[PDB]
Amino acid sequence: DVAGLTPCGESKEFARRLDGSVKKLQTRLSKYEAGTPPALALQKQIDKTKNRFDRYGKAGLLCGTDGLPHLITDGRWTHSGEFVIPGLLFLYVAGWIGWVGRSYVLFARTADKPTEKEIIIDVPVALSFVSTGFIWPFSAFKEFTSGNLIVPADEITVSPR
Amino acid sequence: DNAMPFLERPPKLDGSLAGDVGFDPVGFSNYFDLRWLRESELKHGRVCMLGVTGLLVQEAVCLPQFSNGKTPVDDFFVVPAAGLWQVFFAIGAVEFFSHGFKLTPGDMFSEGREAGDFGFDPLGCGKNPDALARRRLVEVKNGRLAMIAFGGLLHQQLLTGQGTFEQLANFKAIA
Amino acid sequence: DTTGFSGVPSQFARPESGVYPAEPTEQTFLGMRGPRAPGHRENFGGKHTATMLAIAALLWQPVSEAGMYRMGADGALTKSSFSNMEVPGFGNMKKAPTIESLFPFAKNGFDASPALFGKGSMIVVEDPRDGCGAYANSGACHTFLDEIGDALKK
Amino acid sequence: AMSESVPFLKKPEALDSSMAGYAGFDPLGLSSIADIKFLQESEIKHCRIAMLAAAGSIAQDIFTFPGVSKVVGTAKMTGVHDVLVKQGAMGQILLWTSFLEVFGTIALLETLDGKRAPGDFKFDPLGFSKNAETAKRYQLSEIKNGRLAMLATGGMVHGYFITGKGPLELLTNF
Amino acid sequence: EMSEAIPFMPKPANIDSSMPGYAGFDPLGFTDYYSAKWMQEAEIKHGRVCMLAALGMVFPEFAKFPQFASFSTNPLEAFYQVSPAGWGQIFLFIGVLETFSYEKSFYNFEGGAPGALGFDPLRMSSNPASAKQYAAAEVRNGRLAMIGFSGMLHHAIVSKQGPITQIVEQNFYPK
Amino acid sequence: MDSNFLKYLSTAPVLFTVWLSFTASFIIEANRFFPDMLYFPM
Amino acid sequence: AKSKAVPFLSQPEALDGSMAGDVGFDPFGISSVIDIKWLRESELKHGRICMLAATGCLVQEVVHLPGPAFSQKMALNAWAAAPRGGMISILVAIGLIEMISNRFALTATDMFANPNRVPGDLGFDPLSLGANPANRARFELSEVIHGRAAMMGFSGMVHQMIVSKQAPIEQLMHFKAVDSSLMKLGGAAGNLGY
Amino acid sequence: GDFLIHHAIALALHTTTLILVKGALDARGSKLMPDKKDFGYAFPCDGPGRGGTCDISAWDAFYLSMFWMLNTIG
Ligand code: CLA
Ligand code: CLA
Ligand code: CLA
Ligand SMILES: CCCCCCCCCCCCCCCCCC(=O)OC[C@H](CO[C@@H]1O[C@H](CO)[C@H](O)[C@H](O)[C@H]1O)OC(=O)CCCCCCCCCCCCCCCCC
Ligand SMILES: CCCCCCCCCCCCCCCC(=O)OC[C@H](COP(=O)(O)OC[C@@H](O)CO)OC(=O)CCCCCCCCCCCCCCC
Ligand code: KC2
Ligand SMILES: CC1=C(C#C/C(C)=C/C=C/C(C)=C/C=C/C=C(C)/C=C/C=C(\C)C#CC2=C(C)C[C@@H](O)CC2(C)C)C(C)(C)C[C@H](O)C1
Ligand SMILES: CC1=C(C#C/C(C)=C/C=C/C(C)=C/C=C/C=C(C)/C=C/C=C(\C)C#CC2=C(C)C[C@@H](O)CC2(C)C)C(C)(C)C[C@H](O)C1
Ligand SMILES: CC1=C(C#C/C(C)=C/C=C/C(C)=C/C=C/C=C(C)/C=C/C=C(\C)C#CC2=C(C)C[C@@H](O)CC2(C)C)C(C)(C)C[C@H](O)C1
Ligand SMILES: CCCCCCCCCCCCO[C@@H]1O[C@H](CO)[C@@H](O[C@H]2O[C@H](CO)[C@@H](O)[C@H](O)[C@H]2O)[C@H](O)[C@H]1O
């Protein structure tokens, strides 16, 4: 398929990975009686292993010669669930955390003792800030264009050279 | 009188325009220019008078260089495409010259043009003022009548597929 | 201080606009109460919205029943799509976009009607009770009240 | 001030004897909820449509226009509706009443503006309401007959569901 | 002062009624940070490019140039069917046209009106009313063409056809 | 509850430990009910 | 100065009997940490959603739109069967309604910036049913009570559809008691997993 | 495997560059020692005051980047 890779549902080495993984569990299950807790546990593991391999086979992942699923991250839309869509989810959460922490640091600057607010956090005000982060792209961009995100170069302390 | 006596008379409909019976229930002339709306009403009306004459004539007459459709609305589909395009551009040229190249609502009436007026009276039928006033009201009402009538003729000709006069002489209800 | 979730941007060191428009009281039928321009509710108030909704509901009736209706030998009418009409002058495009492209009921199998629901695709109304009563039932019907009676006699 | 129609209840504080068909009957306080001019226009509209509906049920049981019996046979009341939806009859009625209702929407919005009495379409081609007392007598009468026909229409159609007959043959049989 | 487009928000300070397509619409305040006149030149140039581009996505549905008569009516395939010498000539011609805009912006930025590249051969916009109507109409048709081309592009990605063909075949949703 | 004990629970190490224990706990629960999510399923 | 709902506790501050449905019920003192305006916005919003949702479960059991995609008597099955495109259309339309109806004041920090803004009052009165100020107090009270009742009722309906895989009134008319062998509660760590 | 090792090499190149660039650009001065150019390239420290100034010279950034160069070529 892409880059000479094989879809995991028809690669024979993925099938051998699944078979060897289940024989490894079955030889451990061969040392226990049926209704015992180790037998129940190992059967649950065998079912979980089979479920994982079956799901990966039908997901559109591309296995290599090794038979292990490979990730395509060049930007094509048929593989966006492997890097582009997890990446969009990450950047939303990371920008949320950054926007919320910045909002609390600016609130804490206007406090009676600004350094006491950072080792003893005002939890109602900080929870007020953690709730605001869901619309951080719009709030942060409006913050940028209104001249309130970036400070000018002459209010920043720098080294002599 | 008031056309719709239960409704209050629209505020912008003074009697100065001919054909004014105070009929504006939806609420136009409170949003749009009455000068533009009157120009659209006369243009629609004259096009539909010519259209009803064309529909009736083409049911009987056909130029020798052209084929003949089943119906005068099917006459559109047997005249060559280049001919339709030439007619379209000829009408466009007339629209350009008559309005002086000002066609938009914003500029069409910047020269103090009178709605419906293109300075067209070769036979001098509008020489007399009072006769002109009567012919203004006659024009607007015949235009309104031809608008409804053209709608009727075109849709019945599409539905039946049998003209106007042959339809009347061979009337066949919906079954 | 700041109580928390107070909502005033000056208690959270947030930049506010400083402009808080006066809140009016007039309402519109499919709109909201709020600050408008002068003259806005007089031209786009309840009168406008009701009349426009009425005209849209009237013009739905030709649109929902759109098609090429033609007579056969008798008066029987056949319905066809507007696609079958061919425009004669536009080169390689033979069939042309019509009112069926903005309202494609047929592809989704809707059978639209002027009332909005046709014979096909009619609203479905069923009976939950299933033809039995609240109490003292017999057969494949055993209510919550019957189980209250069943538990009390056991 | 107690209600004349429901004596243990108070007067409904939005209804006054200048209205037509007033009996002080608003126990649930609905005249306080909705605008009263809307309620009056809705009542007269419901009244006139139901008067036409009741007369149509009676007349349809008595006689039927030429040709209609072939297209709709044993069917009556709601049963004809579905058959006549297949033909173009019901759709044509919907179209023309909808056309009238667009202007009725404009009329109702003028009524809520306060420039028109509810139910006033000024329609008096023959002359009956020339005199003021006769106009009042007709106004009270038309609300009274419309109310009676509202309940009538209800009864007629529900009797059709129960028996399959309709108003006149339900009188004749059982 | 309040925005006209968005009645509950305050007016964006750096846009004004003087500008032809003004609606008071700047919710994220780009003009509070960037130059309003640079944004107008960019909006007008994007609009002209998208006006041509929307016409170009639709037009080879009707007729093709004889040379490219074999080329596809899906525009995104006809993009790759053209030879690189042809695309090089297109890029050079656009470059020649962009020399006048490279000279307008970056050198005499403050002299003139946004989008005024000295291209008025037919001497329109002489009449002031016509000039106003044409300015606002160019802006609004440019914005409409931007939205229209963006639509038509992604629709050509989903249904592997052109706009008109997609509509006619009723291929309106992902197959 | 006492305001000085609530002020102690607002100190940085307590909130840090509670917040990341809560964070760790819903990652653990999400991987219990939905294990082996190598890709966004689409 | 004791609470009326909970007679052995003190009356919580920020609860002064002005708001409709104010019976002094705040034992955990959420109103002392979270501003009461935000809490009343959230209570009215939750309640309105639930009022529609409870009615949604009951009506969806009885009345359906046409088509096989809408023939799901059990409401928890309607979630999966109803067309995804239209369900995400509902979600996007809800998001647009949330930003516009709140007038871009959505965050906890910015909502109520305008002193004119009232908790739960979004300006929604299309038919001007609240025009009469005599009816205002009991309307506010009965809206609050309908919202609370519907929160409790929808919670019950959803978890009774989970326990019994039946639509709610059909569950009432074809009732079956819990075996207790199935639907065991907890137990993930008692058996040490699996 | 080649993807992962190329990204590790990129990290090593950037980190070695960071110490060497920071050493070159802070060589003339910083906030701890703003007059660092008066003392030269290789000096031990500025003493225990101002919090401590061990490894503050530009030579010491050569010293610290030598470990990262060895790691990178490794
Ligand atoms: C929420 C506060 C906050 C914010 C908005 C930023 C923002 C930034 N940091 Mg800083 N940083 C922070 C906290 C924060 N930092 C803390 C707590 C530390 C100590 C570990 C650092 C240490 C640090 C270094 C060493 C570097 C940055 C860099 C950067 C920049 C790029 C993003 C990045 O590299 O992330 C990197 C983030 C980290 C290394 C640590 C983040 C730790 C957590 C996840 C964030 C703090 C959470 C905080 C407790 C929020 C509580 C909120 C609550 C009170 C409401 C950006 C300017 C880089 C830079 O200058 O690039 C130009 C860089 O090299 N940061
Ligand atoms: C004035 C405009 C107008 C026009 C152009 C039409 C056009 C049409 N109507 Mg509609 N209709 C109108 C007004 C109009 N109607 C009004 C105001 C009503 C009252 C609500 C109706 C009620 C109506 C019904 C119920 C039916 C039609 C039907 C038709 C179709 C008849 C086609 C045919 O072959 O009939 C040829 C028939 C004739 C030439 C005979 C006409 C004579 C009729 C039978 C006399 C009726 C008199 C009546 C009692 C007058 C009282 C008026 C009052 C109650 C409003 C056609 C599409 C029929 C249809 O769609 O069938 C497919 C159908 O069944 N129309
Ligand atoms: C941008 C406008 C737009 C467009 C082009 C579409 C297009 C489509 N939608 Mg819709 N949709 C929209 C906006 C839009 N949607 C919005 C804003 C919502 C949220 C309220 C929805 C919710 C929605 C649902 C839930 C469904 C669709 C469906 C469909 C598809 C089939 C439509 C059909 O067959 O109609 C012909 C059918 C009808 C006209 C029947 C109408 C049924 C009535 C009117 C429902 C009552 C509405 C109710 C009162 C809503 C009130 C809430 C609202 C005010 C917020 C089609 C792709 C369906 C789908 O995906 O099927 C494949 C589907 O199930 N949509
Ligand atoms: C302008 C608008 C006008 C609207 C007018 C209509 C609405 C007016 C308000 C109506 C409010 C509801 C009234 C009922 C309407 C339906 C009537 C009906 O037939 O119901 C339908 C059902 C019965 O349904 C019956 O089914 C039978 C077959 O099984 C029959 O054949 C009939 O179908 C039908 O009569 O009614 C009930 O289930 C009532 C249950 C009991 C309700 C309370 C009874 C009286 C109170 C004493 C109870 C004490 C209990 C103590 C504890 C006991 C614990 C076990
Ligand atoms: C205002 C809204 C009010 C919500 C009320 C909640 C109603 C339902 C609550 C449980 C009902 C009965 C439970 C019996 C069921 C029961 O007790 O099962 C027992 C289970 C532990 O299993 P065992 O050790 O009992 O195994 C026992 C053996 O018999 C079987 O193997 O207890 C739990 O830990 C499960 C709950 C998760 C604990 C963490 C929850 C998530 C934490 C989120 C942050 C805190 C929130 C509150 C946490 C408590
Ligand atoms: C001829 C063009 C035109 C048509 C065909 C048309 C049709 C309908 C229909 C048809 C189904 C409905 C239901 C409807 C309803 C509303 N229109 Mg109307 N409308 C048209 C023109 C304008 C303008 C120019 C404005 C406007 C407005 C509103 C408001 C909000 C008021 C508010 O909430 O305060 C509501 C509810 C104003 C606005 O704010 O729009 C965001 C505004 O300036 N409309 N409109
Ligand atoms: C400058 C100047 C003059 C000049 C000139 C020139 C060359 C002027 C050229 C003007 C042009 C080409 C304007 C074209 C605008 C196109 C638009 C607005 C299309 C929008 C498409 C839409 C909205 C759509 C869509 C679609 C979507 C997305 C989904 C589809 O499935 C379907 C659908 C089709 C509905 C001259 C030469 C006279 C001289 C003068 O002195 C100065
Ligand atoms: C915002 C928020 C709130 C909230 C909220 C909530 C939870 C709101 C939920 C709203 C919902 C559920 C809206 C549902 C809309 C359904 C539609 C439009 C159906 C269209 C059917 C169609 C097009 C069809 C079809 C057809 C197809 C295709 C093929 C046929 O075989 C079948 C069929 C014929 C039927 C509130 C107000 C409470 C408060 C606060 O302000 C915050
Ligand atoms: C405001 C406004 C207007 C409006 C509007 C609207 C849309 C008003 C609609 C309001 C609605 C839909 C209210 C619904 C309340 C539902 C309740 C109280 C259910 C409680 C359930 C319980 C207690 C239960 C239960 C159950 C459980 C758990 C166990 C089950 O086995 C069984 C059982 C069923 C018994 C309009 C738009 C007209 C305009 C106007 O200008 C302004
Ligand atoms: C006139 C529209 C104006 C703006 C429209 C622009 C839309 C903006 C982007 C929305 C994307 C369109 O949404 C896309 O189309 C339809 C909508 O159900 C869905 O398509 C799905 O449902 C349709 C409708 O029955 C089926 O015929 C089709 O087989 C199925 O794939 C796609 O899964 C979805 O990806």
TrEMBL record, chain A:
InterPro entries tied to this protein: PSI_PsaF (IPR003666), PSI_PsaF_sf (IPR036577)
UniProt binding sites for chlorophyll a: D74, W77
Family statement: Belongs to the PsaF family.
GO process terms (BP): photosynthesis
Disulfide bridges in this chain: C8-C63
SUPFAM superfamilies named in the record: Subunit III of photosystem I reaction centre, PsaF
Protein known as: Photosystem I reaction center subunit III
Keywords: Chloroplast, Membrane, Photosynthesis, Photosystem I, Plastid, Signal, Transmembrane, Transmembrane helix
One Gene Ontology cellular component annotation held by this UniProt entry: photosystem I reaction center
Pfam families, alphabetized: PSI_PsaF
Cited function: Participates in efficiency of electron transfer from plastocyanin to P700 (or cytochrome c553 in algae and cyanobacteria). This plastocyanin-docking protein contributes to the specific association of plastocyanin to PSI.
Transmembrane segments: 83-107, 119-139
Keyword Cytoplasm part of the UniProt annotation: no
